[PDB]
Design a protein around this nucleic acid. Structure first.
Ligand SMILES: [Mg+2]
Ligand SMILES: [Mg+2]
Ligand SMILES: [Mg+2]
Ligand SMILES: [Mg+2]
Ligand SMILES: [Mg+2]
Ligand SMILES: [Mg+2]
Ligand SMILES: [Mg+2]
Ligand SMILES: [Mg+2]
Ligand SMILES: [Mg+2]
Ligand SMILES: [Mg+2]
Ligand SMILES: [Mg+2]
Ligand SMILES: [Mg+2]
Ligand SMILES: [Mg+2]
Ligand SMILES: [Mg+2]
Ligand SMILES: [Mg+2]
Ligand SMILES: [Mg+2]
Ligand SMILES: [Mg+2]
Ligand SMILES: [Mg+2]
Ligand SMILES: [Mg+2]
Ligand SMILES: [Mg+2]
Ligand SMILES: [Mg+2]
Ligand SMILES: [Mg+2]
Ligand SMILES: [Mg+2]
Ligand SMILES: [Mg+2]
Ligand SMILES: [Mg+2]
Lengths: 205, 262, 151, 50
RNA sequence: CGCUACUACCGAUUGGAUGGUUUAGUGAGGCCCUCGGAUCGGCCCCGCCGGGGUGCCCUGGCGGAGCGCUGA
RNA sequence: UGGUGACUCUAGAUAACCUCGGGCCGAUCGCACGCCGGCGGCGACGACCCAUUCGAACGUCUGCCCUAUCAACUUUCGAUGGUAGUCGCCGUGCCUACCAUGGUGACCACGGGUGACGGGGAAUCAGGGUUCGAUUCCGGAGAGGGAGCCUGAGAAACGGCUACCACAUCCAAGGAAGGCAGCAGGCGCGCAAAUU
RNA sequence: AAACUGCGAAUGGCUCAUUAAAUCAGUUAUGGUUCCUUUGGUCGCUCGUACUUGGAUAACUGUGGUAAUUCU
């Protein structure tokens, strides 16, 4: 079927190569897993050696890491906004490695508000319904309050991430291969990489 | 050829088996095991061709199925079991013990050992790796992995294994001045003191070895097996004490034996 | 020298560049740490690779490649591809019927790192074997020595 | 068109030879695993479902 | 120049026969994907219920029906 | 912690994840029987992972016959390289998207031919050579010709399957079944080769 | 006996059509992969009816269909 052999190719001198054997099983290839965004659908592939490849066809949840805070959470994949290889991949919303994706920011905001006791991504209406007023102010002993005040001194987020948190969606890069492991994991974009991809996305539209 | 090969042509068998040409087309084809195919002695070859305890392969099978043969203290009923260097073969029914030691001409000699010496063996260490919550592990040339080895034990060293328990009792470090046997190449079977080891990074390391008669020879590092600490071996050596006679002195010795005979 | 010229973001994968920094330690930029490795076999790491900013995943000093096997030498003949050059190896092949040699050559496409600048047509390059980097490239330039009459 | 009729309760089976198309028109155009009232087969088949 | 034979060439014939490469179109069959859902179950519901506690439900074993809920 | 010439190695710490087409964490068999009310000796099967053996698969370097009445070839449908990915057991234009215009050649490229499977080897030979190598060992390829697959650790397997092409068997004409370049043996071809 | 399960059937044997840096040979590499089996290690390391769980199916017994198959 699909082949990955090097002998059907021309020689470096440009001459044709005449095949000396027919297609072998160990040179096979398989159709691409154009993973989409949707309710989870994963198929398994029996591969060489009897092992197993997980072929993700639809995914809607990933495991993404906030590196600057070392906060890894399972979030919901929302949309595909950039692909460095092809534009049709963005047009068809295909999850591949190194694709830029919008992920839900709720778990990260929850962790931030529970770890720093400072609001994140909030509007100025200051609703602060109960069980959030408690998580943000609470009452603590002197030692606990002192520890939180010590934390607050080095809790400052970059403005770009703050804007994204206001919108409720963060930009992330997929570092996994959904068509091989059945998982869409990655890291939240920040720093100069975030600026680069923001400029690229704006210039694309 | 799809899949692994299961036969061995007689003329394609390793030459140190000393197999003839007219007995058959095939050779015993050693089973997969602790020793490589080219560097092993199958049980059938030893039990039939060497010791003459059996006349045919079926007799070797009949011998082994009564559970008389033990290789390193464990009963082995596979007639093509690969027994290799420093292995101990015990037959309790007749009460003898052999150690597979290379002869001077690169062949496994029939070397009988005392039952006291059949309780241990020497193993070259092939690699050391840490795994599974920082537990060190040793791998020997006999494909046995030993966890919690002495931290001094490094690669290319020799460890004395108690066959009954499988634990290390002592070791010899690979260093100049230690006695060694050559387990491969042109000098296979030769015994001598290590003189110098020259390192070639990214390539093979060459070890120089001097005999007890003053002769010197080189080998690759992978062909060196530390036998003893200093000049004294930790095992018993075969009748030829590891020194190689030239064809001239071999002929002279044979002629002297002929003259003294009768 | 801008190093972002592709659709994707170029970055050394081992280095983490988003470590949190307090404003008290914001003296310009943090001077992004550089990943580099010492390839063995007595080859020195060029100072350019250590103090550079180029991104080259095929670089023997800052990329993911292992030097192993054969180490060869050649003369640079062409430098018209991106980050890879064509060198020439000349030798004499013996013919036993006549007891005489004949001059032969073969070209080799070898990857050249951005750490070797001012490479001219004619200098000697010591290259080392690595894993396949492209269809025809299996070697990486490890050392550059100038021609006999350079300025 | 022979009929191979089995009664699981007793384990007994019988091969009947029905050559009348009027009787067999009950089973026509019916798919497998469909329960049909076997009445046209005979008077003794009254109340039987196959 | 004349007599006989052979070989070879050019070959008008717009030669054929066989084979091998391709342009364009058609395209069996497998494989993958998106559907499809003939049938077979399980839970549930009852007529049916064996007994425990006690008519009293926690489990047997049936029949009927539910595009009920799910699985293959 | 340990290692290598060289790891982005090994081990460690942390935050999470962990596929319904699921990963391990024993619902298995036999023989002796025992001791102190529960504990048990030999084995056999099974099992994730690591190592080992048997390999296999891609690569590195050098090496092949004739032919110029084959001198330029490859690149629009990958040719050479770069970036990101897809697929694959993995490294790779292996394939895709976007880039760059490269890559080989009188040191014979490219194309054509071979009564070309390649070696270990064989005949002849003072010395140098010439010719042969289908043929029992090693490696490769194929199972009438192509192609596509299932199962499996391992086939693109043909004494497995599915098609098309060429042949061809039985048939109640609706259908069914094929593959001796295995051992014998028959036909045909031939100057040319053995017993069902 | 049969049948289910497991293993093998990818070795061996044959032939030389294809194949011209291809195959192959010597030399190296996998720090770039897979590996049934044999051998050794690991297998209370995990803080969450068991003195043993469920549904089938073959062999077998009986009704068959087709001119015909290692069909069913
Ligand atoms: Mg496996
Ligand atoms: Mg074979
Ligand atoms: Mg090495
Ligand atoms: Mg077409
Ligand atoms: Mg199709
Ligand atoms: Mg890539
Ligand atoms: Mg590329
Ligand atoms: Mg393209
Ligand atoms: Mg031929
Ligand atoms: Mg030849
Ligand atoms: Mg031949
Ligand atoms: Mg021929
Ligand atoms: Mg052969
Ligand atoms: Mg084949
Ligand atoms: Mg034929
Ligand atoms: Mg086939
Ligand atoms: Mg056949
Ligand atoms: Mg076969
Ligand atoms: Mg025949
Ligand atoms: Mg004839
Ligand atoms: Mg003859
Ligand atoms: Mg069976
Ligand atoms: Mg087996
Ligand atoms: Mg099998
Ligand atoms: Mg084991």
């Amino acid at each position: 079927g699909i082949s990955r052999d090097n002998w059907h190719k021309r020689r470096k001198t440009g001459g044709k190569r005449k095949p000396y054997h027919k297609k072998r099983k160990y040179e096979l290839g398989r159709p691409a897993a154009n993973t989409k965004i949707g309710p989870r659908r994963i198929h398994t592939v029996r591969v060489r050696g009897g092992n197993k490849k997980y072929r993700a066809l639809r995914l809607d949840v990933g495991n993404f890491s906030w590196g600057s805070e070392c906060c890894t959470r399972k979030t919901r994949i929302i949309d595909v906004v950039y692909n460095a290889s092809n534009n049709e991949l963005v047009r068809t919303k295909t999850l591949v490695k190194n694709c830029i994706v919008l992920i839900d920011s709720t778990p990260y905001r929850q962790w931030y508000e529970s770890h720093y006791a400072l609001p994140l991504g909030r509007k100025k209406g200051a609703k602060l319904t109960p069980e959030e007023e408690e998580i943000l102010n609470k009452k603590r002993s002197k030692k606990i309050q002192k520890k939180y005040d010590e934390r607050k001194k080095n809790a400052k987020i970059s403005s770009l991430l703050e804007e994204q948190f206001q919108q409720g969606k963060l930009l992330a890069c997929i570092a996994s291969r959904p068509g091989q492991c059945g998982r869409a994991d990655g890291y939240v974009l920040e720093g100069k990489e975030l600026e680069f991809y923001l400029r690229k996305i704006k210039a694309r539209k | 050829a799809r899949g692994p090969k299961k036969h061995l042509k007689r003329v394609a068998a390793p030459k140190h088996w000393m197999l003839d040409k007219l007995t058959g087309v095939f050779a015993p084809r050693p089973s997969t095991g602790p020793h490589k195919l080219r560097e092993c002695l199958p049980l059938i070859i030893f039990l039939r061709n060497r010791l003459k305890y059996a006349l045919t392969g079926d007799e070797v099978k009949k011998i082994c199925m009564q559970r008389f043969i033990k290789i390193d203290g464990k009963v082995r009923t596979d007639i093509t079991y690969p027994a290799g260097f420093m292995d101990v073969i015990s037959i309790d029914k007749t009460g003898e013990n052999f150690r597979l030691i290379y002869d001077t001409k690169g062949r496994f000699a029939v070397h009988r050992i005392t039952p006291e010496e059949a309780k241990y063996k020497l193993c070259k260490v092939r690699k050391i790796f840490v795994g599974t919550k920082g537990i060190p592990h040793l791998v020997t040339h006999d494909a046995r992995t030993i966890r919690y080895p002495d931290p001094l034990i490094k690669v290319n060293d020799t460890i004395q294994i108690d066959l009954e328990t499988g634990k290390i009792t002592d070791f010899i470090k690979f260093d100049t001045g230690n006695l060694c046997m050559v387990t491969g190449g042109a000098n296979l079977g030769r015994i001598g003191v290590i003189t110098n080891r020259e390192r070639h990074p990214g390539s093979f390391d060459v070890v120089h070895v001097k005999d007890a008669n003053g002769n010197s020879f080189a080998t690759r590092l992978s062909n060196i097996f530390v036998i003893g600490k200093g000049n004294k071996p930790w095992i018993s050596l075969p009748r030829g004490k590891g020194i190689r006679l030239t064809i001239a002195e071999e002929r002279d010795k044979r002629l002297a034996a002929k003259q003294s005979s009768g | 020298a801008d190093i972002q010229t592709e659709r994707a973001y170029q970055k050394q994968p081992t280095i983490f560049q988003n470590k949190k920094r307090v404003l008290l330690g914001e003296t310009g930029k943090e001077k992004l740490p550089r990943y580099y490795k010492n390839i063995g076999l007595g080859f020195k790491t060029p100072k350019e690779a250590i103090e550079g900013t180029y991104i080259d995943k095929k670089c023997p000093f800052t990329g993911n490649v292992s030097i192993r096997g054969r180490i060869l030498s050649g003369v640079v003949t062409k430098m018209k591809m991106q980050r890879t050059i064509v060198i020439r190896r000349d030798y004499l092949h013996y013919i036993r019927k006549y007891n005489r040699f004949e001059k032969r050559h073969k070209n080799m496409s070898v990857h050249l790192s951005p750490c070797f600048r001012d490479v001219q047509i004619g200098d000697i390059v010591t290259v080392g074997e690595c894993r396949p980097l492209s269809k025809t490239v299996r070697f990486n330039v490890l050392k550059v020595t100038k021609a006999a009459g350079t300025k | 068109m022979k009929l191979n009729i089995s009664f699981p309760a007793t384990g007994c089976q019988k091969l009947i030879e029905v050559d009348d198309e009027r009787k067999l028109r009950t089973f026509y155009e019916k798919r497998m695993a469909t329960e049909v009232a076997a009445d046209a087969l005979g008077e003794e088949w009254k109340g039987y479902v196959v």
